[PDB]
Amino acid sequence: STGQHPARYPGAAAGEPTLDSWQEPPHNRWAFAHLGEMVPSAAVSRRPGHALARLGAIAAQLPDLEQRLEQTYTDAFLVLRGTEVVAEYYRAGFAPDDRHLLMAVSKSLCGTVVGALVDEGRIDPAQPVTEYVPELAGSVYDGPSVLQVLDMQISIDYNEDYVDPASEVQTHDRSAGWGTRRHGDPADTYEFLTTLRGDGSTGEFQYCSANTDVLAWIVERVTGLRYVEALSTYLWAKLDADRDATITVDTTGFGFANGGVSCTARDLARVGRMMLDGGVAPGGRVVSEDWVRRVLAGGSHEAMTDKGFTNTFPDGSYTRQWWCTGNERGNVSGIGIHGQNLWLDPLTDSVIVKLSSWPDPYTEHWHRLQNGILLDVSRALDAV
Amino acid sequence: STGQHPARYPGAAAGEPTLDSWQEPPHNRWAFAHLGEMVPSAAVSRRPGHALARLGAIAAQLPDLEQRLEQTYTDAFLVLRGTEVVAEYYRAGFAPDDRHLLMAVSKSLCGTVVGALVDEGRIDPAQPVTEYVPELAGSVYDGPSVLQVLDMQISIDYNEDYVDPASEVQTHDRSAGWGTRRHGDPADTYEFLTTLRGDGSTGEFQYCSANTDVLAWIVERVTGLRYVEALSTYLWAKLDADRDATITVDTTGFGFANGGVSCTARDLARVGRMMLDGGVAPGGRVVSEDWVRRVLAGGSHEAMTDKGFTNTFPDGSYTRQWWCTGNERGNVSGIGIHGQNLWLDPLTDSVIVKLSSWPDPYTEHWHRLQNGILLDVSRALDAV
Numbered sequence: 001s002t003g004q005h006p007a008r009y010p011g012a013a014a015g016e017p018t019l020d021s022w023q024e025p026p027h028n029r030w031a032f033a034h035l036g037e038m039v040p041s042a043a044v045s046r047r048p049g050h051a052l053a054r055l056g057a058i059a060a061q062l063p064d065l066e067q068r069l070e071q072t073y074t075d076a077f078l079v080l081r082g083t084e085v086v087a088e089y090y091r092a093g094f095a096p097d098d099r100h101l102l103m104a105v106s107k108s109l110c111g112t113v114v115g116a117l118v119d120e121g122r123i124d125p126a127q128p129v130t131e132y133v134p135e136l137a138g139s140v141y142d143g144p145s146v147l148q149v150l151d152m153q154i155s156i157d158y159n160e161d162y163v164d165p166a167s168e169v170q171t172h173d174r175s176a177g178w179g180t181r182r183h184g185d186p187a188d189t190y191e192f193l194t195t196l197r198g199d200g201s202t203g204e205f206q207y208c209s210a211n212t213d214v215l216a217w218i219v220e221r222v223t224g225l226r227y228v229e230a231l232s233t234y235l236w237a238k239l240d241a242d243r244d245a246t247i248t249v250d251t252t253g254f255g256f257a258n259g260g261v262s263c264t265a266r267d268l269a270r271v272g273r274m275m276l277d278g279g280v281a282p283g284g285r286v287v288s289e290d291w292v293r294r295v296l297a298g299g300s301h302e303a304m305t306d307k308g309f310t311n312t313f314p315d316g317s318y319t320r321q322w323w324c325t326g327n328e329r330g331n332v333s334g335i336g337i338h339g340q341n342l343w344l345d346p347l348t349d350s351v352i353v354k355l356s357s358w359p360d361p362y363t364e365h366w367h368r369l370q371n372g373i374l375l376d377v378s379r380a381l382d383a384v
Numbered sequence: 385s386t387g388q389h390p391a392r393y394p395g396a397a398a399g400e401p402t403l404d405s406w407q408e409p410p411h412n413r414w415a416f417a418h419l420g421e422m423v424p425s426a427a428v429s430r431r432p433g434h435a436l437a438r439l440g441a442i443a444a445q446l447p448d449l450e451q452r453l454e455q456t457y458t459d460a461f462l463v464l465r466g467t468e469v470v471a472e473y474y475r476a477g478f479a480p481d482d483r484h485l486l487m488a489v490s491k492s493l494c495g496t497v498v499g500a501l502v503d504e505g506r507i508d509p510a511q512p513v514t515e516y517v518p519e520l521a522g523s524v525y526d527g528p529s530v531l532q533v534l535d536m537q538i539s540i541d542y543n544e545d546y547v548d549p550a551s552e553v554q555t556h557d558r559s560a561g562w563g564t565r566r567h568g569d570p571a572d573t574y575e576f577l578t579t580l581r582g583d584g585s586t587g588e589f590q591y592c593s594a595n596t597d598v599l600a601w602i603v604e605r606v607t608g609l610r611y612v613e614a615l616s617t618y619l620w621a622k623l624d625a626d627r628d629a630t631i632t633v634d635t636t637g638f639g640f641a642n643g644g645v646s647c648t649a650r651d652l653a654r655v656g657r658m659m660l661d662g663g664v665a666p667g668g669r670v671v672s673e674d675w676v677r678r679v680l681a682g683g684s685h686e687a688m689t690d691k692g693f694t695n696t697f698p699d700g701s702y703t704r705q706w707w708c709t710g711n712e713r714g715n716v717s718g719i720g721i722h723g724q725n726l727w728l729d730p731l732t733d734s735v736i737v738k739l740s741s742w743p744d745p746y747t748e749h750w751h752r753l754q755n756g757i758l759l760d761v762s763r764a765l766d767a768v
């Protein structure tokens with residue numbers, strides 16, 4: 001039992017509707033207006049082939065930038081300096097207003113929602129996860145504080161070998177609908193989370209996507225809103241975005257908070273703009289000045305033992321669902337597999353969005369190239 | 385074997401990607417930009433409770449109209465007289481720009497695409513289905529002409545008892561992803577179609593959703609385009625619609641042509657406007673004047689033996705995926721279960737869109753009420 005969860009619609013029974021009941025009353029009134037949430041669906045374009053390159057100014061400083069973007073399988077690239085879009089690139093076949101999967105950049109958005117609730121006093125990061133999700137008692141999340149989830153400083157037995165279907169990484173995906181269910185798999189994401197275990201130690205960084213989903217679960221218990229709605233109410237609806245964002249949902253309607261959000265490059269930049277504006281967005285304050293300051297300040301360096309990160313960023317750290325480089329520019333970034341970045345360059349008051357599709361989720365090679373681009377573009381924005 | 389089908393993306397292998405391979409190259413470049421086509425997804429609103437009733441003029445003639453709409457579980461209602469929206473209604477919780485499942489009104493859209501191709505000389509309705517889809521040899525579609533599919537005049541052993549999972553109606557849904565697959569079910573919609581059989585007789589009307597999917601299959605074989613794209617290229621992209629429409633897709637990416645399209649009420653009205661404009665839309669001619677004329681003229685009355693239709697419309701018929709009332713007003717309508725109608729009233733040059741969610745897919749009761757409303761509103765538009 002995973003306890004109470006936000007109903008898919010007002011008055012809906014637990015877990016309703018399912019793929020086999022959405023056509024029945026009372027579910028159908030809701031389902032007929034949100035079928036994409038139940039069945040895979042394609043867009044039928046209202047509009048009746050070549051890459052779009054508008055690298056503007058930085059072009060002179062970075063002559064081979066377009067080629068570098070192509071080399072890193074770039075789908076969408078956008079640089080926002082202050083409130084102005086100063087550079088843009090979209091591969092052939094990807095429109096400027098098309099949406100792109102964010103993978104783990106989604107985590108930084110979730111952390112933002114949590115931050116909003118902390119500001120409201122609805123969530124106390126010092127409290128144990130079980131204070132908000134009692135059903136996580138008996139799991140690896142029994143004992144750790146919400147802040148430890150936010151900073152991913154919980155030791156968890158989590159097999160990351162996606163080649164092995166028995167791995168936690170693969171099981172997590174199947175439990176959420178990202179892959180075909182296998183006999184024995186948990187019914188939904190909530191159930192999957194309760195199956196996680198660890199030695200009980202905390203304090204050391206361990207990147208684990210399950211942590212973000214636990215944060216989303218906490219968000220639901222504290223607000224009573226489906227994570228999908230909370231993500232809109234506390235963040236998306238305040239950005240004055242061009243388009244809605246989307247998020248994959250599991251069989252209960254629970255959004256895949258750790259990596260299932262998709263949005264346009266320009267809209268993602270609005271999240272970065274909000275961060276560089278002390279937590280304020282066009283529709284109102286999203287998070288407190290303090291929350292933003294803590295994100296830019298970074299997490300405990302000693303907790304960060306991931307060489308994949310520290311080899312490039314020796315003084316790097318992680319906090320509140322954001323990667324902190326700890327470099328001379330104080331760069332902080334949301335990061336997602338296959339080349340997704342919501343990169344903040346406070347020095348130039350700029351945001352760099354890079355959405356890609358590397359053939360591999362992660363390799364030292366791709367990261368070296370990707371970071372080289374983000375750093376070069378950041379430096380190209382410096383006053384000279 | 386169901387033969388060649390349009391690749392999900394340029395160069396894609398047959399059936400790729402699947403729910404278990406979309407994250408892999410080369411599929412991921414496409415998948416990351418169209419994840420909703422693979423995994424159920426929810427919209428994260430960019431916008432931060434009460435019914436909207438703007439029945440304008442017809443209000444005076446139909447004082448209790450709003451109540452009548454509520455009684456028939458109306459979600460969206462819109463009347464377009466000429467090029468002007470003269471009446472609108474949206475239930476509480478449904479925004480004017482929200483999309484709604486069209487159910488079988490989707491069939492009329494498919495027939496329109498077929499008509500466009502007939503006008504181009506790419507499809508000859510007199511030709512046997514097997515001329516375009518040879519793989520349907522050995523099935524109930526081996527022998528009948530494309531026109532017989534268009535007019536649904538093929539006898540098919542098709543169990544319509546949805547309560548029975550073994551029924552063709554239920555199996556059709558599961559094969560397309562509208563329901564959870566059961567061991568033994570066809571892998572996709574194409575395969576399901578090839579399993580259909582009949583006594584070989586033709587000429588009498590038999591409403592069967594499988595017919596529309598065969599039409600979509602023909603569309604794909606003749607154009608080489610995924611039905612999703614053909615629906616946009618030959619119809620949607622020429623309407624100057626406010627929003628994209630959406631269509632559910634099965635595991636191969638094949639759109640559920642018979643009933644999976646969703647769109648706004650106002651945009652659906654643009655389809656009716658095109659029909660009343662002799663087949664021309666803002667973006668160009670969609671179908672020929674002759675095609676539209678044949679739709680308004682109706683099909684063979686003798687073929688129409690469905691009492692559920694003739695008890696209300698004695699001189700009714702069906703042709704090219706449209707229901708023809710044969711009444712004194714010459715009303716013709718796209719119809720879908722649970723109360724969906726794309727109703728044409730040529731006399732007043734008006735289109736009536738009614739999207740609903742009746743608790744039941746079909747009952748004499750709901751239809752009596754629904755038709756009473758459509759007829760009363762049509763008459764209220766008459767010059768006096």
Ligand SMILES: NCCCCCC(=O)O
Nearest residue numbers: 103104209258259336337
């Ligand atoms: N859990 C499935 C993949 C989620 C994305 C993870 C990441 O981008 O680091």
Ligand SMILES: NCCCCCC(=O)O
Nearest residue numbers: 487488593642643720721
């Ligand atoms: N084949 C699943 C239902 C399709 C809708 C049918 C109809 O509206 O008549």
